[PDB]
Amino acid sequence: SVVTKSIVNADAEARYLSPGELDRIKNFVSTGERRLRIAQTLTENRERIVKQAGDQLFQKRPDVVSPGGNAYGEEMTATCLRDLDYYLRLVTYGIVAGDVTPIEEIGLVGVREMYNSLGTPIPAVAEGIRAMKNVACSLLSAEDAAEAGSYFDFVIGAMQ
Amino acid sequence: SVVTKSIVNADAEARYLSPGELDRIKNFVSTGERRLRIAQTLTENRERIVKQAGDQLFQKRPDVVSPGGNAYGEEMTATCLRDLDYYLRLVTYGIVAGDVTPIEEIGLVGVREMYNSLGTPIPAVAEGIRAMKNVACSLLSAEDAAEAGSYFDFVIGAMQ
Amino acid sequence: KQNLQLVIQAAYRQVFERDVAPYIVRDEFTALESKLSNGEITLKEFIEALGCSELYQKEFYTPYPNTKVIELGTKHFLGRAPLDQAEIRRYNQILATQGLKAFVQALVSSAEYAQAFGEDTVPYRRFPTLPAANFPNTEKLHNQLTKQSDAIVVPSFAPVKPRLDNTKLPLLSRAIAEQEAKARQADPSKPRFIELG
Amino acid sequence: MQDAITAVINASDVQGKYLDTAAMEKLKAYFATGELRVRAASVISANAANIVKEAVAKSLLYSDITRPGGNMYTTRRYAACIRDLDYYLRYATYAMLAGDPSILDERVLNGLKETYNSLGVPIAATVQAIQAMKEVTASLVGADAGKEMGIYFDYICSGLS
Amino acid sequence: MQDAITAVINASDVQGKYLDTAAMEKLKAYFATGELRVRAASVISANAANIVKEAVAKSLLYSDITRPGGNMYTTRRYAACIRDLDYYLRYATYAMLAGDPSILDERVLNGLKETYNSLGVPIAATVQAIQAMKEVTASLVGADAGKEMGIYFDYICSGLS
Amino acid sequence: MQDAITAVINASDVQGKYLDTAAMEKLKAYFATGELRVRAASVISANAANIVKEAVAKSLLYSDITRPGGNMYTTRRYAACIRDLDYYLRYATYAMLAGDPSILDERVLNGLKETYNSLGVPIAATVQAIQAMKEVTASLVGADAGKEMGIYFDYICSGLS
Amino acid sequence: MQDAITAVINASDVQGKYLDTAAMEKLKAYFATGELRVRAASVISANAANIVKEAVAKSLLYSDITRPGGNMYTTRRYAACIRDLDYYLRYATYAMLAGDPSILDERVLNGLKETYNSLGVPIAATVQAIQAMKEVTASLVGADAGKEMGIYFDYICSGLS
Amino acid sequence: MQDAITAVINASDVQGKYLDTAAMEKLKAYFATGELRVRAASVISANAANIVKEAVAKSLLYSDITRPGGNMYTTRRYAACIRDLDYYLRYATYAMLAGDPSILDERVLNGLKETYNSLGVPIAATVQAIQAMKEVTASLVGADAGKEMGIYFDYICSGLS
Amino acid sequence: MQDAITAVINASDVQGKYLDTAAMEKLKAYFATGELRVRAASVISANAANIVKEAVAKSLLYSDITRPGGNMYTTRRYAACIRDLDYYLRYATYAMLAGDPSILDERVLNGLKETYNSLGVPIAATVQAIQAMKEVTASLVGADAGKEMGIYFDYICSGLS
Amino acid sequence: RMFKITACVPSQTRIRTQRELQNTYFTKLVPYENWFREQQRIQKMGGKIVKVELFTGKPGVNTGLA
Numbered sequence A, B: 001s002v003v004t005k006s007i008v009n010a011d012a013e014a015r016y017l018s019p020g021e022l023d024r025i026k027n028f029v030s031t032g033e034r035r036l037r038i039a040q041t042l043t044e045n046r047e048r049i050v051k052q053a054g055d056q057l058f059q060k061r062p063d064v065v066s067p068g069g070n071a072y073g074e075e076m077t078a079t080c081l082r083d084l085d086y087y088l089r090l091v092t093y094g095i096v097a098g099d100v101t102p103i104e105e106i107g108l109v110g111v112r113e114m115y116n117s118l119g120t121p122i123p124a125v126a127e128g129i130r131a132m133k134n135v136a137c138s139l140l141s142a143e144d145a146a147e148a149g150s151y152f153d154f155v156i157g158a159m160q
Numbered sequence C: 001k002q003n004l005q006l007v008i009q010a011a012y013r014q015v016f017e018r019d020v021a022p023y024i025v026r027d028e029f030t031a032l033e034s035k036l037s038n039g040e041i042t043l044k045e046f047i048e049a050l051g052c053s054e055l056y057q058k059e060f061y062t063p064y065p066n067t068k069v070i071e072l073g074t075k076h077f078l079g080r081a082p083l084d085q086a087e088i089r090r091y092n093q094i095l096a097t098q099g100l101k102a103f104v105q106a107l108v109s110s111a112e113y114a115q116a117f118g119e120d121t122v123p124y125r126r127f128p129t130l131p132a133a134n135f136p137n138t139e140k141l142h143n144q145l146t147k148q149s150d151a152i153v154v155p156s157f158a159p160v161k162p163r164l165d166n167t168k169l170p171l172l173s174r175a176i177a178e179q180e181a182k183a184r185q186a187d188p189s190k191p192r193f194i195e196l197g
Numbered sequence D, E, F, G, H, I: 001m002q003d004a005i006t007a008v009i010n011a012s013d014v015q016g017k018y019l020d021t022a023a024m025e026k027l028k029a030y031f032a033t034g035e036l037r038v039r040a041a042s043v044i045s046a047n048a049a050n051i052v053k054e055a056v057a058k059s060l061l062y063s064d065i066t067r068p069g070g071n072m073y074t075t076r077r078y079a080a081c082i083r084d085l086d087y088y089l090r091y092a093t094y095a096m097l098a099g100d101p102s103i104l105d106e107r108v109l110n111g112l113k114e115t116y117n118s119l120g121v122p123i124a125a126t127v128q129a130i131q132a133m134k135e136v137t138a139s140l141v142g143a144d145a146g147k148e149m150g151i152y153f154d155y156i157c158s159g160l161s
Numbered sequence J: 001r002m003f004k005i006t007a008c009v010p011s012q013t014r015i016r017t018q019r020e021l022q023n024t025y026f027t028k029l030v031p032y033e034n035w036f037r038e039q040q041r042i043q044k045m046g047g048k049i050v051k052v053e054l055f056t057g058k059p060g061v062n063t064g065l066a
């Protein structure tokens, strides 16, 4: 969260929070209701976001669903859709927190290594999350879509 | 090479070459005939090793040559076989050198970075080189195959 | 370049206690300044730069009290445990008023780092001898694996009240007897001596 | 390290469920209280040294401890004592800003009583001193922010005790 | 590093006079373009790897430089080239967000030309490659933001040349 | 750290005796089995990642541990788990090459149970995982070498218990 | 670290009084004895190697301790043992010069017990060795100085035991 | 560091071609001479102290350089001079074993001129001394080996000059 | 407390398997050796007093330990020392009869270190004494039984040290 | 404000069999904060400070320092 990041930096430099950091958390506090509303609509539409974004991802990357691909067969495809659902959940967490700290702490620290042990391609995971971003942005209002899409953008950038 | 690696270690500890190290240098030089013979076999059969092993790789991993894959199209598949050709060349160099430092110096330092930038699957490259090793077993006698196999083993192990 | 990659990785192993592939999103270190360049040619600077970094902060400053930060810092950079309460106090001043960057900078700049490890050596597990409590403390620090405990092996060095009171010791006792007895006795070089009580 | 928001989302993350309405309610409550938290932190940042000075005078001065042989006597020991009070006040404002006492347990109260026992510092007198700090800081930040500062100051006292 | 606001304030500070009316106008202009800067940064952060990949393919691949003896041949040298391009793109976005080229000067260009010359890096090839990056990133962010982006990419080109 | 030869000569040194005929026996036996050890080490060095991959799939995946709230859940903890398996396999190959389990006790199993208990890692689940590794690595190296790998994988299991 | 003078003034400082006439008498006594201390230090500093040699020969040699598997066997351990004996003699003469045993407790005997237990060093054998050192050094410095070196050597013995 | 094999394969790598029969011939030639290189290395390893001693006596000693004010005067300076000669001979034997001058060029010669000029060490005298070393080592190893060594000694001389 | 049989069945119980054929082979081996154990116990039980007497005479007597101020001086302490030696011999033969050292670790060596450190007993002197006991008891029971009594005596020595 | 420096470190304390050229003559980028502390340490060590440059930063800047 923004509050914990400000406290962490202040603790590292052994000084009380500067008025700039205090103003930063104050403005974040003010926009908290909008953040919660964005997370609420995302979780309300979580099922269709995952479903149709996954279909777009398969079209974008046919090799994934081709024989020999990581998500070959209905069982493997089901688990990949589960991963997409997990990342949507992390994105809602991050929007509520106001920082990418929860997303990083839960599903971006060692993401490369976990996927290489699994055998799964990280860039293809990024493409799937891009599809989720498109669906979520369509569901959201223009102002709301900019914020939530930015969180999706961080996730895909880390995947790359 | 064995000579240069021994010299490097002796250089670090500030010692003239130990009598045992001198024996190893002498032995490697003398068996250089066998080393050159093995390398000569591999360069004589560069065409079939790459061609047969690459076809085995494509069959084992259809997703790489599938549409929306890294190797789709004859142009891309030609470049893929070119990469396998490069690695076989490095292996012959390593056999001649008697050490894997030429192979590492040329083509295993940063393969993950390069191949991820290209989009190529690093485990798939490893499986292709495994195919080259299996093809090599028939071409080389059992005693000879063990010697070349170790260099192939280092390449695949670094790749994964 | 082969050795340079080994030494870069070794600096990770000593400073962060493990290879950092788990626990980092992306590799957040540009080793190019150290490699074939003079920007961080000083490993005395590459180690310090890693120490300043967020990863060290998250791993060893964020989760532990400053006392444990000091013990871990001397393990990670100087290869030993805090020598005595003097270093505990100095580094606590620095951690109190200037933070992690200054504390790591102080450890690496210290004449101890330079004398033992030097400009061009990744710091290594040192087996100290001369400082008296330092060796047992150092073994206790190094035997622990990472994140084993929340306890501070070297909490602080306790002062001790000596059991044997001096001015009972043989030399002072002789002298105290002499000064007392000679004072009560007659005094040389004085006119009046029978008057004094 | 955790805060109110991080604790709520982590609690839901363990389940793996998306944020439900009760979790949203807890987050809303923290957002509602956040503005006064920010104001209180800005206030005691301004008066940090003065708060320490007032508390030290209130309980730690003109007493045997600062008189010879009392452990606050000696100029070094006086500097160390006021440094610890600075530490406690700064971590108290961290905990108040976060809305969680995890910082106090993680960075203050772990291995603190043992070090104080080894040093010879009186844990009781430190607890009294930070209680005085609690009074002064509550007056400066106001009553409700004073309640919030108080719970974390009491947390520190309990850890020392 | 100096922001546009930081540079303007610094000039006023050197004079010792308060912010001039022209200084206020400069600050207003930077604030006017700031939101566009934020949007462009978000866009190329998401597509950073793709931008580098496209530029490398456009000019650096299937050429003599990547063929043996051309300085991009060998796995380590190819990895160094691609990470240099991502360095250039990342510092370019820092400069675009800042509204000033100070970051490029202090953290990028210094010693870069001399070290490239010592290594044997083809500076002309790198300049053409980052020009290709400029084209790709301009398409992604938009013409207006791309035109602003180009001045900093060209600044990198001039320092390299 | 020790090996078979070092252990034999160290025991003889402790008893202040030149190498016995029984000590010479142990040395000969190690030399007879040594080439087999070297070949096995080469095999699992090449397939180290694959062995970990299979074992993780065969006992640690699609289970309550990797589902939320089961410790292996979270990408951090998954990376830590697979890294620990690579640690165990690498130290097992060290022990097999040496012909002595002293490496395992001195560098792996000292404090490992204590750390795992503090972390919350399931010692039972790690033991199951490395037994799965034992099966996979036995298949790759062969029966004779697989026996040798087993007497060190089981050693690690017993230490974890 | 403390001296006889430093201890006297520190005691008076704890009470908060300027140096009393009784404190002055203690200080005067130490000054009277200082020359004798300096002489004794000059003697054993010259004969430090001889003192260690004689003590080692009298108690530590031609026994199982310095034959295979005895903790003094191996040249590394023999060097370490004689180095520890010179450590003890050097700090003992520091304490004799100071007229205070605070040196020994602060430096020599802080965890020395624990180190020797860890290392496997026989505490009893070290105590015997420094007892032999005490006999030799007492003979060298004379009776009155020897009973001063004796108390510090026995203090070290008690700390070890 | 580079050697004959490394140079041959490096040239082939720049060519982008597999090992040609001409390249194999070059490797065969290096193998043919490797036998003599090994025994020459053994000889001067054993006699390295004698070689340095003889060269120092031949040119460096009984001169104003080792007389006061000559920069070789002072025991520290003399030790440094013979240390440098040991360095040169050891690196020469490394280059002779390798069959390549890369080790000299990179590990030794670069920066040596700057350090020697800054310190005031006479490069002319060093060149003369290593020339004397070359003569002595040629006598000890033999004529054919002396040809092999002398080129590397001259390479070092040129670098110093 | 455990036996060889109890240890075998407890290991099988931990795995949750009925006694395997390998477990049966261990049990059968212990049964085969039981008669030899019973014989050895019958021997040393009869000679327990003699074993203690000889060991005390060989190592503990006519030394400073049993002369004024030596920890064995005073009849109370002499009785305690010989009582501890009979304790060690009695538990050693219990462990020999059982075929398991769990008796020694559970009973003999639980805090025995700490008690002796508190009491001031010299650990090294006790270890020497029980070493002498080991020599005497090995001679009485014979070579094969002696090497069984020997391991348990050495286990006690290691616990003390 | 990284300072590019060129310096020597001759050492009379010991004679070193292992490589010493690397430490002896070097050029390093020292930040503005570190430079005073490092300058004092190297000056105390007695090495000659051959060259100094302001590699990063500007010769004088009131605010906006790196």
Ligand SMILES: *[C@H](C)[C@H]1/C(=C/c2[nH]c(/C=C3N=C(/C=C4\NC(=O)C(CC)=C4C)C(C)=C\3CCC(=O)O)c(CCC(=O)O)c2C)NC(=O)[C@@H]1C
Pocket (backbone or CB within 6 Å): D057, D060, D061, D062, D063, D066, D067, D072, D073, D074, D075, D078
């Ligand atoms: C003196 C010439 C100037 C001055 C001083 C002043 N000091 C105080 C209060 C305290 N001073 C001390 C000092 C020490 N404590 C130590 O342990 C030592 C070393 C042995 C020293 C020197 C302490 C502890 C206090 C606190 C009160 C106490 O002792 O309990 C005051 C009172 C401050 C107040 O307003 O409360 C003053 C005024 N004032 C001057 O004008 C002089 C220039």
Ligand SMILES: *[C@H](C)[C@H]1/C(=C/c2[nH]c(/C=C3N=C(/C=C4\NC(=O)C(CC)=C4C)C(C)=C\3CCC(=O)O)c(CCC(=O)O)c2C)NC(=O)[C@@H]1C
Pocket (backbone or CB within 6 Å): C065, C066, C067, C085, C088, C089, C092, C093, C156, D065, D070, D071, D072, D077, D078, D080, D081, D082, D084, D085, D087, D088, D107, D108, D112, D115, D119, D121, D122, D125, D126, D129
């Ligand atoms: C003041 C209210 C009381 C007091 C304090 C006193 N404390 C010390 C020494 C230390 N205190 C700490 C505690 C902390 N370190 C931290 O980093 C933090 C925040 C994370 C805390 C709370 C530590 C580590 C020390 C020792 C190291 C040091 O000197 O800083 C002393 C000094 C004791 C000594 O003589 O060495 C004193 C005097 N003294 C009082 O009388 C008050 C009741």
Ligand SMILES: *[C@H](C)[C@H]1/C(=C/c2[nH]c(/C=C3N=C(/C=C4\NC(=O)C(CC)=C4C)C(C)=C\3CCC(=O)O)c(CCC(=O)O)c2C)NC(=O)[C@@H]1C
Pocket (backbone or CB within 6 Å): B064, B065, B070, B071, B076, B077, B079, B080, B081, B083, B084, B086, B087, B106, B107, B118, B120, B121, B124, B125, B128, E060, E061, E062, E063, E066, E072, E073, E074, E075, E078
């Ligand atoms: C084949 C087994 C797999 C595969 C690979 C693939 N690679 C590329 C492109 C390149 N590969 C290299 C490789 C090297 N450069 C080196 O210096 C060395 C060491 C000597 C190696 C191995 C390079 C440089 C390129 C870039 C193109 C170029 O050479 O200029 C491609 C083409 C990607 C594209 O779209 O352009 C492919 C497909 N693909 C597979 O499916 C296999 C699993």
Ligand SMILES: *[C@H](C)[C@H]1/C(=C/c2[nH]c(/C=C3N=C(/C=C4\NC(=O)C(CC)=C4C)C(C)=C\3CCC(=O)O)c(CCC(=O)O)c2C)NC(=O)[C@@H]1C
Pocket (backbone or CB within 6 Å): C030, C032, C033, C035, C036, C037, E065, E070, E071, E072, E073, E076, E077, E078, E080, E081, E082, E084, E085, E087, E088, E091, E107, E108, E109, E115, E119, E121, E122, E125, E126, E129
């Ligand atoms: C890619 C466009 C071209 C290319 C590049 C190449 N560069 C290097 C080595 C270095 N690159 C840098 C660059 C930076 N370092 C930084 O900290 C930053 C941040 C602003 C940048 C941009 C540096 C300093 C070096 C030297 C240090 C080092 O060796 O790493 C290499 C490696 C050369 C080698 O032989 O190993 C290469 C290949 N090469 C090309 O062919 C492209 C045209």
Ligand SMILES: *[C@H](C)[C@H]1/C(=C/c2[nH]c(/C=C3N=C(/C=C4\NC(=O)C(CC)=C4C)C(C)=C\3CCC(=O)O)c(CCC(=O)O)c2C)NC(=O)[C@@H]1C
Pocket (backbone or CB within 6 Å): A064, A065, A069, A070, A071, A072, A076, A077, A079, A080, A081, A083, A084, A086, A087, A106, A107, A118, A120, A121, A124, A125, A128, F057, F060, F061, F062, F063, F066, F067, F072, F073, F074, F075, F078
């Ligand atoms: C998805 C778009 C792509 C893909 C993925 C894929 N993943 C798996 C298996 C697993 N994925 C995870 C992921 C996570 N665990 C976490 O804790 C988190 C953060 C909260 C994440 C993201 C895990 C643990 C597994 C292992 C199975 C399990 O959960 O037990 C598979 C199955 C792999 C297999 O063969 O077993 C696949 C296929 N596949 C694709 O094609 C997409 C590009």
Ligand SMILES: *[C@H](C)[C@H]1/C(=C/c2[nH]c(/C=C3N=C(/C=C4\NC(=O)C(CC)=C4C)C(C)=C\3CCC(=O)O)c(CCC(=O)O)c2C)NC(=O)[C@@H]1C
Pocket (backbone or CB within 6 Å): C018, C145, C146, C147, F065, F070, F071, F072, F073, F077, F078, F080, F081, F082, F084, F085, F087, F088, F107, F108, F112, F115, F119, F121, F122, F125, F126, F129
């Ligand atoms: C995988 C089979 C299981 C599992 C593992 C898991 N482990 C950790 C953390 C640590 N593991 C170690 C162990 C070692 N350190 C070493 O150096 C070596 C070789 C000498 C070993 C074996 C250590 C020290 C840690 C802690 C420090 C660290 O993070 O590396 C975790 C992380 C726990 C956490 O949340 O912090 C996990 C998850 N988890 C499973 O579910 C498997 C049963």
Ligand SMILES: *[C@H](C)[C@H]1/C(=C/c2[nH]c(/C=C3N=C(/C=C4\NC(=O)C(CC)=C4C)C(C)=C\3CCC(=O)O)c(CCC(=O)O)c2C)NC(=O)[C@@H]1C
Pocket (backbone or CB within 6 Å): G060, G061, G062, G063, G066, G067, G072, G073, G074, G075, G078
């Ligand atoms: C013989 C060639 C020369 C010589 C030697 C000499 N040595 C001693 C006494 C001791 N020697 C040792 C040696 C070792 N201890 C070790 O642990 C090891 C490594 C395995 C070695 C080599 C030791 C410990 C002693 C001390 C006595 C003892 O062992 O208990 C003596 C006796 C000295 C005396 O007067 O007491 C001698 C004479 N003497 C010569 O003339 C030869 C040139």
Ligand SMILES: *[C@H](C)[C@H]1/C(=C/c2[nH]c(/C=C3N=C(/C=C4\NC(=O)C(CC)=C4C)C(C)=C\3CCC(=O)O)c(CCC(=O)O)c2C)NC(=O)[C@@H]1C
Pocket (backbone or CB within 6 Å): H057, H060, H061, H062, H063, H066, H067, H072, H073, H074, H075, H078
């Ligand atoms: C002397 C009692 C023993 C001895 C010595 C001996 N020395 C040499 C030659 C040289 N000695 C030096 C010494 C120094 N150079 C210094 O700068 C300093 C410090 C100021 C010292 C002490 C040097 C430089 C030489 C070399 C010749 C020269 O000065 O140019 C010799 C001659 C060796 C030869 O064969 O050439 C000898 C014999 N010899 C003994 O028998 C004594 C035990």
Ligand SMILES: *[C@H](C)[C@H]1/C(=C/c2[nH]c(/C=C3N=C(/C=C4\NC(=O)C(CC)=C4C)C(C)=C\3CCC(=O)O)c(CCC(=O)O)c2C)NC(=O)[C@@H]1C
Pocket (backbone or CB within 6 Å): H065, H070, H071, H072, H076, H077, H078, H080, H081, H082, H084, H085, H087, H088, H107, H108, H112, H115, H119, H121, H122, H123, H125, H126, H129, J009, J010, J011, J016, J018, J019, J020, J021, J022, J024
């Ligand atoms: C002897 C032939 C001449 C001579 C030499 C002399 N050299 C130094 C000091 C240094 N020499 C070096 C050179 C090297 N360092 C290396 O690591 C290697 C191997 C790669 C070489 C060749 C260096 C770095 C130094 C300085 C650091 C150091 O002390 O090692 C001195 C000392 C100068 C001083 O006073 O500080 C001397 C005297 N002197 C002569 O008269 C001969 C002509």
Ligand SMILES: *[C@H](C)[C@H]1/C(=C/c2[nH]c(/C=C3N=C(/C=C4\NC(=O)C(CC)=C4C)C(C)=C\3CCC(=O)O)c(CCC(=O)O)c2C)NC(=O)[C@@H]1C
Pocket (backbone or CB within 6 Å): I060, I061, I062, I063, I066, I067, I072, I073, I074, I075, I078
């Ligand atoms: C004499 C009147 C009778 C006698 C005695 C005898 N005693 C011993 C040996 C020892 N005696 C002691 C006695 C004590 N230890 C104490 O702490 C105290 C209290 C202060 C006493 C009385 C001890 C410890 C021993 C052991 C040897 C030693 O001291 O080191 C012997 C020697 C036995 C032997 O063969 O070794 C004898 C002969 N003998 C007689 O004939 C008298 C009737």
